[PDB]
Every structure is written in C-alpha cells, then in structure tokens.
C-alpha cells in the first residue's frame, strides 16, 4: 500500500506557460512503475502518460514526463485552453494500485 | 556490498522474425526436394505464452515461397507462343452417351514447321471450356488476349512433398499442445521444438484434402465472428474417404512446331466416352454434418436452424471444388453435399469436368498448359477440413445459412501453422552478488 | 477503433443487490486482454475495485466477498460483455462506475506488472445514487 | 532439463544449466541456398556481435566471471532472497530494462582502468 | 573525443582510448544492392576474424594492452622512452619500423611456444 | 508556324494476337524518329 502525494493542490496559469506536476510516492519505485492521467470535468479520464516517460498514440510532444526516485514530474509547456482539468499521478507497482490526489488547473 | 555479474545462457527470449529454409529427407519435382537438408521437443514448466493465428508471420513467407518455386520450373522448357491461330472446330462422336456432347470438338489448325516457308495441317481434341468462338464455325484459345500460353514442364510432377521450414541457430520455435486450441489466447502447454512437422502442400478450395485431424472435437476457426465478410475454418476429428476417377483413356500425340520444339496434344480415345467422377460416402458425411453442427450451436446458441446450402456464384475456381489428381486439374460441381435443413450402403457421386488452361494463384498474364496423361486416372483422398462463409441476415430471425466458400490459398495453409511461434534467444543477463575480482 | 458502452443512470435501494453491465466493440478476445473495473466517488478520488485477467477474475482487500465480475467471449449475434454484481450494498456507493480494458498481449510492453496495469481505454461511467 | 528446460524456474535455480544454451548459439543459386546461406550469415554475425561484447569486458571463456563495479541502490533495492528465490529471468530483464545502458558502459571504463593499471605493476 | 579523434595526438595520450576503436570494427534478392550488402558483411567478418587470429597464436586473445617476454633489440630503434611517447605519433612510428616488422611478427609466435608443456606430462 | 514540318501522321500494319491476321492502325511521330526511303516511304 503506496499512498501518493500529489502538489500543488489547486493552481492556476495562462495561455502559453509551463505547468509543473510533482508527485512523491511513500517508498522508492525505482522501477519507473507510474502512470499520468487526465480527466476532465465532466467527461472521460484520458490516460496520457504510461511509465513516466513514454508518450501515447495521440498525445502531443508538448508534454514531458521525468522520474527520479521517488520524485516524478510532469511538464506541460505551450499551454492552450483545451488542457484546463485534473490530472492524477498512479502508481501500479505493488498490489493493488493507488490514485494521487488531484491537481486542477484554472485559467487567469 | 553488491557488486556486478554477467551471465551468458540465461532462458530469455523476446519476439521477432528471420528467415526459414526446407528440410527434406531424400523424375523431378515442382518444389525442390533435393535441394533441402536432410532431416527433439523439451516441454517447459511455469511459463505462458499468447499466441495469435491471424498476425503470423510463416503464412505470408510460406505464400511467397510456393509462388517462387512455382515459377522456376515453367521456365527453361518449351513455350506454346505460336499456338493462337485460327482453329476449325467440330463436334466429335464415337458411341457418345446422353449429357456428354458439347464437352468435347475436334479441332483442326494450321501450324509452322521446322523449316520456315511450310506449313501443315493437323487435328487434335479439345475441350468445351478451353475454346471460344469468334464472329462450319471458327474458334480460338480462351487465354490468348489477356495471357501467353506455355506448356507445363514435362518431366516435373505434381506429387506433394512434405518440408519443413526450419529455423537457423539463435533462434527457437516454441509449440502449443493444447487439444481444444482455437488459434487466440493464452496457452498453459508450451514446448519449445526444432522446427515443425510434414505440411503437405495441397492447393484446393472448400476441401482440405490431406491436412491434418484433430484430437478431441471437431473445431471452429474464425477471425471476426460479427463480421459477414471473414472465412470460416472446420477441423474434423475423423477423416471421409473419397475416390475421384477418370475412365478416359486420353493417348498423347507429339507434334515438332519447330527446331527442337515439341507439343503434346490429344490423340484418339479408345472405349467409352464417360464422366468423371468422384464417390463420397454417404453414411459418414451425415454424421460429419452433425458433429460439425454440435459445435457450430455452440457460438449462436440452442434455438437455431442450421441451413446449409451451396454456393452462389463467380469465378469457376471459387464456386466449384477444384484441386489435382494424377497431374489433371479437376473441377467438381459438389452441389450435392451442402444441401441440408437442421433443426434444434449408398454413396453420392459427383461429376467433375477438365480443364487444361489453368490460371494459378489469381494472376493476370501468367498461364499454363498442362499435358495429357496416358492411361486411366484413380486416387483416393481424405477430407479433413471444411471453408464455409455465412451472409448478412435481418438480425431478427433464427435461421443461418452457411456456404463453401474459398479461393484464397492463405486460408489452406493457416491451418497448419496456428500453434506455432518463433522467438529469438537473448543470453546476456546482469545480476547483483556479494563477490569481488581476484 | 475500441469502443465501449455502459448502462445507465439505476436508483437501487438498500438492501437489494445491483447488475453494471459494460459491452465492447473492437476487441478480439479476452484472452489476449484484461478488463479493470474502478470507480470515482463525487468530489473524492478514484478507487480499485476489481479486474478480470486470464479468465480469473479477483477483487481488491476491502471488496473481498461483496462483488462478482464475470465475462463471456465473442458471439456472432452480440458484443463482448461484463458483467458486475453489487450485493448487499450500503448508503455509500453512490458513485460513478467506469469499465477499462487493457491489452496484455506482448509481455514487453510495459503496460502491465505482473497481474496488477495501467488503464488504455475508459468508458462513459453510470452514476449508482443509493437512498432509503 | 535440456534446451531451455529452467524457463520457468528461479534465478538461482537457472544459474547451473547455463551451459546447455551456451552450446546451441552457432550450429546453383537456387531460392532453398541464399535462404540457408542468409541464415548462415546471421548465424555467424549473432555469434560475433555477442563474443566481441564478451571480449570487450573480459570475459573470454568465461560465465559467471565477476566484475569490478559497484551495484547502486537506485537500480534495485531488493536483497538477495527476492531476486533469486522469487523473481525469474524473463521478469528481470524487464526490472532494469532501463538502466542497462549505464552498466554496459560502466562496464567497459573499469576495465580499460584495470589494463592501464597492469602497466604500472611490472615495471617496477 | 570519438572515433579517430586521438589521431593527431602522440602515442601517449592516443593510447589510453583503445576502448572506442575496439567497438568499431564489426558493425534480400540478388539484385544490384542485394549482393553487395552480402559482400560487406563478409569483407566486415573477414577482416575481423583475420585480426584476431594473430592475437590467439601470440597469448594476448582478449587483451588490448598487452606485453610479452621479447627483449627489444637496440638495433629497430636508437630513441629513448621520450622522444617517441611525447613526440612521435602513430602515424609516424609505423613507417620507421615497416623493414622491421616481419622480424617482430616471427619473435612472437615463437615465444608463446617456448612456453608450453614439456615432459612435465611424463 | 515554327511547327509546320514537326510531327507526322503515320500508317503502318502490324500483327495481332491471332496469327494470320493483320491490321491498319496509324500514329503521330516526330521528325527526327523517322527517316525516308529513297506520300512517301518512311522507317
Ligand atoms: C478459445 O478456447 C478457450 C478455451 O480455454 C476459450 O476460453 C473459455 O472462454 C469462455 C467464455 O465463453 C469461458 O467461460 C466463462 O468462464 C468464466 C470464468 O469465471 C471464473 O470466475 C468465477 C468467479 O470466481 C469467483 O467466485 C467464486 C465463487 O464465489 C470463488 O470461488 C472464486 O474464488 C472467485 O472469487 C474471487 O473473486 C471475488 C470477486 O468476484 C472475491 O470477492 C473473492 O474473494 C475471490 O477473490 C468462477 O466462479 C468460475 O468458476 C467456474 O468455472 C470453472 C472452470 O473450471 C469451474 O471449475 C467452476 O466450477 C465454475 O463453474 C471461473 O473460475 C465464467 O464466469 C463464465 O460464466 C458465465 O457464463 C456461463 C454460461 O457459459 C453462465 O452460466 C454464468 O452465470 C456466467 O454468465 C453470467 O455473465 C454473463 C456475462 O455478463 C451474462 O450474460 C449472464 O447472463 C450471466 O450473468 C448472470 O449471472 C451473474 C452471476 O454470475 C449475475 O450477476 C447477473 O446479474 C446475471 O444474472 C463462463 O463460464 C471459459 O472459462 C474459458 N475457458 C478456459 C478459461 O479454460 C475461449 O473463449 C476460446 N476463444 C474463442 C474465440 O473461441
Ligand atoms: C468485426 O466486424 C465489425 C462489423 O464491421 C467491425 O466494425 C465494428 O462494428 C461495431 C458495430 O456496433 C462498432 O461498434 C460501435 O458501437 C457504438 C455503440 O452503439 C450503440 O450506441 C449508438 C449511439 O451512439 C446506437 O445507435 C447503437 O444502436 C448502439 O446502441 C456506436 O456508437 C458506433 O457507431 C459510431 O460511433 C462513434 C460515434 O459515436 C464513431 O466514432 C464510430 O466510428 C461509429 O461510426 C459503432 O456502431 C465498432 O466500432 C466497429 N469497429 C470499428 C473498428 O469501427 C469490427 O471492427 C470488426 N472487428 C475487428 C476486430 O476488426
Ligand atoms: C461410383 O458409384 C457409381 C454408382 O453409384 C459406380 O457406377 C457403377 O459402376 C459399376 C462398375 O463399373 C457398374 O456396373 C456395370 O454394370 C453393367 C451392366 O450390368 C455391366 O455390364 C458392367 O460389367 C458393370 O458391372 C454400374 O452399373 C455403375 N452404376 C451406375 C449407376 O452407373 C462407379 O463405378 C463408382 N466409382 C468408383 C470409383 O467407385
Ligand atoms: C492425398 O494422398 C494420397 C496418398 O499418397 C494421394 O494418392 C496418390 O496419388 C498419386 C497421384 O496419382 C498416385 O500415384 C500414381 O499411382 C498410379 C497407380 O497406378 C501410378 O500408375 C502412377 O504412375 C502414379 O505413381 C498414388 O498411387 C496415390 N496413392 C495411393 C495410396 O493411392 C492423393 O493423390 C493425395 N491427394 C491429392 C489431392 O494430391
Ligand atoms: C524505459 O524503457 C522503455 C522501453 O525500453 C521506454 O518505453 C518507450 O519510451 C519511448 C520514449 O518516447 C516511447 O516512444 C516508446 O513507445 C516506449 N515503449 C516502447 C515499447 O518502446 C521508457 O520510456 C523508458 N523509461 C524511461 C526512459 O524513463
Ligand atoms: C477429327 O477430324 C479428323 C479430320 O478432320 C479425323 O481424321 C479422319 O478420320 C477418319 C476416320 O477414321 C479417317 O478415315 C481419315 O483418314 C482421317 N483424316 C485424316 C486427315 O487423318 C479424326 O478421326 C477426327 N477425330 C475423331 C476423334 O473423330
Ligand atoms: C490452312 O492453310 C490453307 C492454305 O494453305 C487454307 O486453305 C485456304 O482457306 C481459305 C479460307 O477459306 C480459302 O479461301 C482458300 O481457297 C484455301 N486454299 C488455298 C490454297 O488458299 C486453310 O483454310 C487453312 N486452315 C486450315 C484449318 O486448314
Ligand atoms: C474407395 O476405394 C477403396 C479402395 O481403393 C475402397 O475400399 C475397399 O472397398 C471394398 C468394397 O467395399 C472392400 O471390399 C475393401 O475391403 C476395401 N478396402 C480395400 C483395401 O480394398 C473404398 O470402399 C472406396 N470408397 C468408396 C466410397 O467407394
Ligand atoms: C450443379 O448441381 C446443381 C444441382 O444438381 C445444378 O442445378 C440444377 O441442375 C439440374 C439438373 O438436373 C438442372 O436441370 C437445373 O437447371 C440446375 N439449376 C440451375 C442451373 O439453376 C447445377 O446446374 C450444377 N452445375 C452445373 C455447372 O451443371
Ligand atoms: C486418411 O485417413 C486414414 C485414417 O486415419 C489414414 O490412415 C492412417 O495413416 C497414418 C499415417 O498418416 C498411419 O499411421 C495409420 O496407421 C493409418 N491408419 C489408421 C487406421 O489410422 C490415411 O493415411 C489418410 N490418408 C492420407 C493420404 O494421409
Ligand atoms: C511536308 O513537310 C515537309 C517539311 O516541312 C516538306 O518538305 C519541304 O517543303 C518545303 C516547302 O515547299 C520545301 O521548300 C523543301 O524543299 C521541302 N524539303 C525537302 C527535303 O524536300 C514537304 O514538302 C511537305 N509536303 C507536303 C505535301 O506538304
Ligand atoms: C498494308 O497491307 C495492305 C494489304 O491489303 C497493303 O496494300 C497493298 O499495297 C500494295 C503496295 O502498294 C499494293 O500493290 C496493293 O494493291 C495494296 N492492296 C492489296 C489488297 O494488296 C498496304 O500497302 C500495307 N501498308 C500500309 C501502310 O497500309
Ligand atoms: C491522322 O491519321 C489518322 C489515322 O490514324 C486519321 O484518322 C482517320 O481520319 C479519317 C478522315 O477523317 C476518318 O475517316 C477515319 O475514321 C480516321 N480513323 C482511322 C482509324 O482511320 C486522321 O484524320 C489523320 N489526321 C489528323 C489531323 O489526325
Ligand atoms: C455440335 O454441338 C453443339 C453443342 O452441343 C450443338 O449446339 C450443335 O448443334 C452440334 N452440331 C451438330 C451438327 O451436331
Ligand atoms: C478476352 O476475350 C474474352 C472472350 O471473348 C473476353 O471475355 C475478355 O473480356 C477479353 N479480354 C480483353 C482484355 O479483351
Ligand atoms: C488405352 O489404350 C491402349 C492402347 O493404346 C490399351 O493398351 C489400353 O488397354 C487402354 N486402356 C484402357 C482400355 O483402359
Ligand atoms: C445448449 O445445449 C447443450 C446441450 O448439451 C448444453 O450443454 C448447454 O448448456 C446449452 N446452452 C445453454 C446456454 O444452456
Ligand atoms: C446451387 O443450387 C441451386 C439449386 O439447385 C442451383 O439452381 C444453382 O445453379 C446452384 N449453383 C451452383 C453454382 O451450382
Ligand atoms: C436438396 O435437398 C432437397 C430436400 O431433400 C431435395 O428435394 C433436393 O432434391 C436436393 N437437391 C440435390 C441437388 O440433391
Ligand atoms: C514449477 O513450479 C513448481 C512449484 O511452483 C516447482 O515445484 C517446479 O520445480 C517448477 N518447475 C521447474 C522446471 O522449475
Ligand atoms: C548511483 O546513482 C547516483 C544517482 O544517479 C549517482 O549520483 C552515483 O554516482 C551512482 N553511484 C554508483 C556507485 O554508480
Ligand atoms: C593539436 O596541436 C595542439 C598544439 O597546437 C594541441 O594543443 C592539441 O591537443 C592537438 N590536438 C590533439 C587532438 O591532440
């Protein structure tokens, strides 16, 4: 049972920013057994990134993902108006898997 | 207090493809039997592997290795490039039965020598589906102004021999022993091999003849099973004999077209003038019907009417039952076998015509001659296998109606290597001990 | 591509039992796949609950004995189906279910750990709202 | 067991038959003889590109020849009973699947550090 | 530095990065490109396989630095330990020993033979 | 009327897929694809 930090709680950015989404795990994943999701208010969750560093089919490149130990960030430069929702950091190394916290991203 | 160590030989393999040569054990041949090498299975333990059918990679390669030995034997023979003249074609009879005349004409033409400024006339036999005509009455080949006709090779066979397409070192193939695999999933059972086992390879459409049985049922292949549009394969547990013949005598006549060139056509037929014909049991295939049936109620379920009816139409080689006895092509009509309603000592004979203009493979320009044979003509063959398609209904109604379906030689031959897989062995591997060096 | 479909909107009272079902369209089998079901509390955060993997199907530590997952393959007259049973729920299940697949074909993907993955494809989620 | 026979067992118990796959890594113009030649040509270059990284860090003849190199705690954390008692071989290629390429080059400095510092022994 | 980039150095800084030249010399018809495709990786194994048979009949099979018990004889060379080092590099050292090489290439095959087994075995 | 002599209408026979039969067609050709035998002859 790994519990998962997620930070910040809410924050907020403009058009054409970089938002920074940190997550620190409870042991050491060294591994690299973490996952980034995104999901709307209202819609679908869309899972973005798979193992910390690996981009999907449909995703763009604008997204970065990194890991180091226990630490694993999440960069979203050239911020447009269609990525404004949650985004959850979860781990599927032990069993069974565990969520974040939550991260939501107003506009201002 | 860790340190580093490399190990050489650890049992890891990941997926990938190569390259597979023949290995046989050993008058010519079509495909090379004494151009392969002459000719043990270790069962594994605590170990899974999903396997697929449908994204093999052996099929394709065994596709394009048929037709690359398929067209080096045509070549360094004589071709039959003079041959489309002007025939004179009348019908032919010497105490001819009922339903027989219109298959056969005597033909006469004109044809080059082996000096240049000469000519002669000859006269040879032909049959219904070789010759059109054109507007006593003038006639001319069917495969002249789309495809050049050559004779086949005379001093090949087109017996089936067994290969095996065997992998080189480095690699492994690994082998599902399930009983009831169906081609898709996980298998509990695998156990890695040389290479496999003596695939025949039989060109027919709707009937695997000389394949291979299965072990406990009869079993039900397909890809998409929403979908109208995919091919059904049927695997029996048990094999229907079925004898095919001939009772034509059909004597050759060598004719020099020119310096060196021969051409083999046919003479006079001594006896009768019947039909050829193929027995079939009649007691095993209702039985066959009903196991294939138990099995096929198990995907639509218990309260449907199983109909079962034949084809509807299109090219010759699709519609009806075509394969290759004794060096002749036969096309049989088999109309009389899927002609069936299920609901929830005699033997059927059918009648099959010859054709000597045979076009393989689907292709459009590359055609064939194949020579008469002297003699009468009888084999026996086993049924282990069945192509059976199913059209789109009003998804209200309870009623399927199941059609022999075929043409495609990918399908005859999937059904082979569907339990069969090739990985490649990586024996490199990094482990943490308590050692140091000297 | 893979598309799936889920129920609606069901009331339940306590003390009954409850019937999610989840139908595919895309898939081959489900043998070379592994279906996950989750589910999302309103203003709280997602939470396990089962998966379907191999043809064994399990549950998670605090879900032990109180649901059922089943699954059946591919029929020529109707999609892939799964199936979750509630019973014996109480005044707090009122929440979003969602249906997952996962392909667990190449054993290098990287997508799975041993028994215990990621989620590729989400559906649309049915909102279960308990009352007395 | 035979070809492949411990596949499924641990890495420990895998560790001892390393030999039986040691042994089976090498061995007209017509379509059946550039198919065998090809495969021969394979055969032999999968053979070299793995003896030559065996060279490379001085493992001539050798299986189980021990390093010089550290083992960091940031690769794995696991003690000596989780990896070879639990996991196995086709699980631990994956475990630190991306932290090879450091090793293969950690590998080759050190020894390259060991020559050079043969040198300087005999020629006092 | 990379691949050949110690070349104008001298023969005691281009010595220590062996390493990087010693990973760099070994790596469907019959078309026009089908054959020479078939030709390069037989020159490429050829010329691999040629170089380390002379390393296995002198004793240093898996060793990139490695010295023998043949004494140097003061006629090949009348220079000292530091005029050839820090001054000389590899592509000049090569065309003062070339009437030499021959005699060095015979003294080592000897030496790895002079020192088998003997009688010892009985 | 710079392309006054340029291109040519030619007829010829030529064979057919049967054998004993021929047949007239005709083409356009350039000036300097063809040359005369001494309308007029032409190869
Ligand atoms: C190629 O060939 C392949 C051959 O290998 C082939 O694979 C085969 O595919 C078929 C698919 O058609 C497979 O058949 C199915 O198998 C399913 C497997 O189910 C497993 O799991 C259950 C549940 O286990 C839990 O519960 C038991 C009992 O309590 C416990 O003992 C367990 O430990 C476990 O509990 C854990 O989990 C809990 C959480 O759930 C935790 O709380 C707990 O703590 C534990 O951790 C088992 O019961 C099953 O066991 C049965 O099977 C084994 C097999 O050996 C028997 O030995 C055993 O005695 C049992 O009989 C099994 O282990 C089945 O679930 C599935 O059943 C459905 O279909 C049948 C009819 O076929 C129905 O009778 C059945 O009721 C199921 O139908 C329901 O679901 C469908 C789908 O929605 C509905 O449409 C249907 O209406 C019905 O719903 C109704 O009932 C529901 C309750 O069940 C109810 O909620 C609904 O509301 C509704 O009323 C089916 O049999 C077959 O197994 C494969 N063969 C294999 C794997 O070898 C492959 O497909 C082929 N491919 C192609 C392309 O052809
Ligand atoms: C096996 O063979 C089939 C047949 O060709 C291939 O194609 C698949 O066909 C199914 C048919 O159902 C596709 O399934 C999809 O189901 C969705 C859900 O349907 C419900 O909801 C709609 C309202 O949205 C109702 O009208 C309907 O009655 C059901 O109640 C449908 O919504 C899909 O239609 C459209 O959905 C979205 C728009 O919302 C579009 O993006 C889609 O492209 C589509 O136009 C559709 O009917 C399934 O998606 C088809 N597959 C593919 C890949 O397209 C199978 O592909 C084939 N199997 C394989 C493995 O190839
Ligand atoms: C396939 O089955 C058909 C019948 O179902 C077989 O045809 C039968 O063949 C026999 C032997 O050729 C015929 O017998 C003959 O009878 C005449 C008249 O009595 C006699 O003079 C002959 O000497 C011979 O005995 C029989 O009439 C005939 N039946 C029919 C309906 O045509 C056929 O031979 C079978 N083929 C194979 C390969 O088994
Ligand atoms: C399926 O396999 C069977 C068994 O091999 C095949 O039957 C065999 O067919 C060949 C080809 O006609 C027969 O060879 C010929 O035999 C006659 C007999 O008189 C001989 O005169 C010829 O010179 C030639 O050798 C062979 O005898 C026959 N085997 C048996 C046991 O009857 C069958 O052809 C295969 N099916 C297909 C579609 O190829
Ligand atoms: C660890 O290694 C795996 C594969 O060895 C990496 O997964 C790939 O990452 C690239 C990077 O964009 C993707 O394009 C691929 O689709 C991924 N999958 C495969 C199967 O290649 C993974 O990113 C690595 N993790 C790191 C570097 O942190
Ligand atoms: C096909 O037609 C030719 C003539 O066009 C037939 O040849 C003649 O056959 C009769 C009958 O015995 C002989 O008297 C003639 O001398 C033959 N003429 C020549 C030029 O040979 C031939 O018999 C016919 N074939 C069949 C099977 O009836
Ligand atoms: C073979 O060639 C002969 C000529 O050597 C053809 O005979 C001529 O046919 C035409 C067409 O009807 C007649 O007009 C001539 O009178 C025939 N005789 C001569 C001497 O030219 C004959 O038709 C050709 N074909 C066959 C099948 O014999
Ligand atoms: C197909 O031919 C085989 C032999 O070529 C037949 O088998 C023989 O049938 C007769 C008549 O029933 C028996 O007396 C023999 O004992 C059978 N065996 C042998 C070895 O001769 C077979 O019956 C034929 N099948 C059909 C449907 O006619
Ligand atoms: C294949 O067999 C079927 C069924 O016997 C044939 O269909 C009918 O056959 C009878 C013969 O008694 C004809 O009188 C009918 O006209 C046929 N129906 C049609 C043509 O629609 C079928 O003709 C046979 N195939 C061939 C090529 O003869
Ligand atoms: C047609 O089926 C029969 C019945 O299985 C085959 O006869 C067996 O053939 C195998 C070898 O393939 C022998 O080991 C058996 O002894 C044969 N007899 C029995 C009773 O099983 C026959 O070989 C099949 N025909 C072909 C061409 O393979
Ligand atoms: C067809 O075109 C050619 C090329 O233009 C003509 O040849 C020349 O015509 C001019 C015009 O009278 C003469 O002055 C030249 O002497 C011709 N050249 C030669 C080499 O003779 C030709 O006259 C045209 N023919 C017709 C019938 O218009
Ligand atoms: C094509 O063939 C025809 C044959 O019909 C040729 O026409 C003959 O040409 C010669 C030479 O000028 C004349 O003597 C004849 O009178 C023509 N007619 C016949 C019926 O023989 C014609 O010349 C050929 N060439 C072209 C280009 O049409
Ligand atoms: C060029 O030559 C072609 C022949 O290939 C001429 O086409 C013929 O013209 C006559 C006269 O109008 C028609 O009666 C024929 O029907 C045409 N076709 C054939 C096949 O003979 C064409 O007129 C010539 N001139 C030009 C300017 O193209
Ligand atoms: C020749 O056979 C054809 C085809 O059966 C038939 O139409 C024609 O009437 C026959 N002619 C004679 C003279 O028998
Ligand atoms: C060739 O002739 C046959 C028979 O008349 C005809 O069906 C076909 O369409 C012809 N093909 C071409 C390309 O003219
Ligand atoms: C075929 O004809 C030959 C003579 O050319 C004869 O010897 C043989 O018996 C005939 N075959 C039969 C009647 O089956
Ligand atoms: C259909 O009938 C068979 C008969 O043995 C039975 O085994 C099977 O369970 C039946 N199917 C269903 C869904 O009950
Ligand atoms: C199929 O059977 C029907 C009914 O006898 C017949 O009319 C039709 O011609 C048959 N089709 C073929 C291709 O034989
Ligand atoms: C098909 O079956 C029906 C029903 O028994 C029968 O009347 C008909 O004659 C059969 N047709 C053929 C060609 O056997
Ligand atoms: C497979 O596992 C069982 C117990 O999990 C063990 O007894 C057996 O030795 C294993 N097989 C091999 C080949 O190691
Ligand atoms: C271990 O990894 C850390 C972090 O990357 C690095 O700073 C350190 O040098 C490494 N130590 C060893 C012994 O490899
Ligand atoms: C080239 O010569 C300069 C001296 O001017 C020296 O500093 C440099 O290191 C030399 N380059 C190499 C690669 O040794």
């Known amino acids: 049972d790994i519990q998962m930090t997620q930070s910040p709680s809410t924050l907020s950015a403009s058009t054409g920013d970089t938002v920074r989404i940190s997550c620190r795990a409870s042991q050491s994943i060294t591994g690299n057994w973490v996952a980034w999701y995104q999901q709307r208010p209202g819609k679908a969750p869309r899972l973005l990134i798979y193992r910390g560093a690996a981009l999907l089919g449909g995703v763009p490149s604008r997204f970065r993902g990194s890991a180091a130990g226990t630490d694993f960030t999440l960069t979203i430069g050239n911020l447009q108006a269609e990525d404004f929702g949650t985004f959850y950091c979860q781990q599927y190394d032990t069993y069974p898997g565990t969520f974040g916290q939550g991260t939501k991203v107003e506009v201002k | 207090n860790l340190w580093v160590t490399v190990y050489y030989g650890v049992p890891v393999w990941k997926d990938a493809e190569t390259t597979l040569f023949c290995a046989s054990d050993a008058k010519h041949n079509v495909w090379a039997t004494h151009a392969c090498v002459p000719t043990q299975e270790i069962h594994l333990e605590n170990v899974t592997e999903e396997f697929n059918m449908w994204k093999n990679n052996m099929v394709e390669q065994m596709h394009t290795d048929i037709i690359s030995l398929w067209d080096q034997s045509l070549k360094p023979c004589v071709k039959l490039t003079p041959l489309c003249v002007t025939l004179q074609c009348t019908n032919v009879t010497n105490n001819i039965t009922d339903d027989m005349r219109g298959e056969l004409k005597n033909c006469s033409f004109n044809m080059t020598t082996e000096l240049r400024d000469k000519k002669q006339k000859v006269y040879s036999l032909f049959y219904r589906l070789d010759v059109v005509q054109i507007n006593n009455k003038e006639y001319r080949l069917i495969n002249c102004n789309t495809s050049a006709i050559t004779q086949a090779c005379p001093k090949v066979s087109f017996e089936p021999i067994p290969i095996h397409y065997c992998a080189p070192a480095g690699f492994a193939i690994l082998k599902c022993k399930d009983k009831k695999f169906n081609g898709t999933g996980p298998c509990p059972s695998v156990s890695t091999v040389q290479c496999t086992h003596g695939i025949k390879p039989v060109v027919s459409t709707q009937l695997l003849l000389n394949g291979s049985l299965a072990e406990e049922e009869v079993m039900i292949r397909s890809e998409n099973i929403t979908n109208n549009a995919k091919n059904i394969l049927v695997q029996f547990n048990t094999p229907v004999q079925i004898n095919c013949t001939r009772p034509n005598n059909n004597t050759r006549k060598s004719i020099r077209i020119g310096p060196g060139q021969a051409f083999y056509a046919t003479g006079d037929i001594i006896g009768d003038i019947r039909q050829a014909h193929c027995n079939v049991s009649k007691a095993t295939w209702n039985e066959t019907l009903g196991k294939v049936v138990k099995q096929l109620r198990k995907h639509f379920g218990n309260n449907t009417i199983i109909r079962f009816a034949n084809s509807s139409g299109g090219d010759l080689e699709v519609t009806t039952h075509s394969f290759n006895c004794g060096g002749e092509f036969f096309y049989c009509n088999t109309s009389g076998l899927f002609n069936s309603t299920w609901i929830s000592n005699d033997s059927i004979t059918l009648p099959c015509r010859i054709k000597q203009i045979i076009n393989m493979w689907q292709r459009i320009g590359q055609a064939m001659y194949a020579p008469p044979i002297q003699g009468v003509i009888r084999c026996v063959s086993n049924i282990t296998g069945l192509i059976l398609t199913r059209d789109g209904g009003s998804t209200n109604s309870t009623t399927e109606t199941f059609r022999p379906g075929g043409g495609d030689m990918r399908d005859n031959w999937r059904s082979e290597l569907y339990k069969y897989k090739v990985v490649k062995i990586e024996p490199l591997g990094v482990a943490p001990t308590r050692c140091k060096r000297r | 591509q893979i598309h799936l479909v889920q129920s609606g909107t069901e009331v339940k009272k306590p003390g009954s039992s409850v019937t999610v079902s989840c139908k595919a369209y895309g898939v081959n089998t489900f043998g070379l796949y592994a279906v996950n079901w989750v589910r999302q509390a309103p203003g709280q955060s997602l939470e396990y609950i089962g998966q379907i993997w191999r043809w064994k199907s399990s549950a998670s530590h605090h879900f032990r004995g109180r649901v059922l997952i089943s699954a059946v393959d591919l029929t020529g007259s109707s999609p892939p189906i799964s199936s979750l049973e509630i019973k014996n729920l109480t005044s707090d299940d009122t929440a979003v279910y969602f249906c997952?697949?996962?392909?667990?074909?190449?054993?290098?993907?990287?997508?799975?750990?041993?028994?215990?993955?990621?989620?590729?494809?989400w559906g649309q989620g049915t909102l279960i709202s308990v009352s007395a | 067991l035979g070809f492949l026979g411990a596949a499924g067992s641990t890495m420990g118990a895998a560790s001892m038959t390393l030999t039986v796959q040691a042994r089976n890594l090498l061995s007209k113009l017509t379509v059946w003889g550039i198919k065998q030649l090809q495969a021969r040509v394979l055969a032999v270059e999968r053979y070299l590109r793995d003896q030559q990284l065996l060279g490379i860090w001085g493992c001539s003849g050798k299986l189980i020849c021990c390093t010089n190199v550290p083992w960091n705690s940031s690769w794995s954390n696991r003690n000596l009973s989780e990896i070879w008692d639990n996991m196995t071989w086709l699980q631990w290629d994956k475990e630190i699947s991306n932290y090879t390429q450091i090793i293969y080059g950690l590998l080759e400095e050190s020894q390259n550090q060991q020559e050079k510092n043969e040198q300087d022994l005999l020629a006092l | 530095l990379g691949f050949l980039g110690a070349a104008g150095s001298t023969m005691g800084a281009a010595s220590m990065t062996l390493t990087v030249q010693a990973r760099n010399l070994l790596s469907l018809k019959l078309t026009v490109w089908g054959i020479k495709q078939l030709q390069a990786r037989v020159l490429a194994v050829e010329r691999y396989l040629r170089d380390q048979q002379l390393l296995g009949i002198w004793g240093c099979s898996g060793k990139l630095i490695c010295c023998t018990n043949v004494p140097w004889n003061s006629s090949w060379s009348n220079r000292n330990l530091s005029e050839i080092w820090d001054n000389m590099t590899w592509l000049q050292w090569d065309k003062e020993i070339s009437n030499y090489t021959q005699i060095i290439y015979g003294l080592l095959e000897e030496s790895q033979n002079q020192q088998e087994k003997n009688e010892q075995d009985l | 009327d710079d392309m006054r002599g340029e291109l040519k209408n030619c007829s010829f026979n030529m064979t057919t897929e049967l054998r004993d039969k021929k047949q007239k067609v005709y083409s356009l050709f350039y000036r300097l694809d063809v040359v005369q035998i001494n309308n007029k002859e032409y190869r």
């Open positions: 997952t697949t996962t392909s667990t074909y190449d054993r290098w993907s990287g997508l799975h750990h041993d028994g215990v993955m990621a989620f590729s494809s």
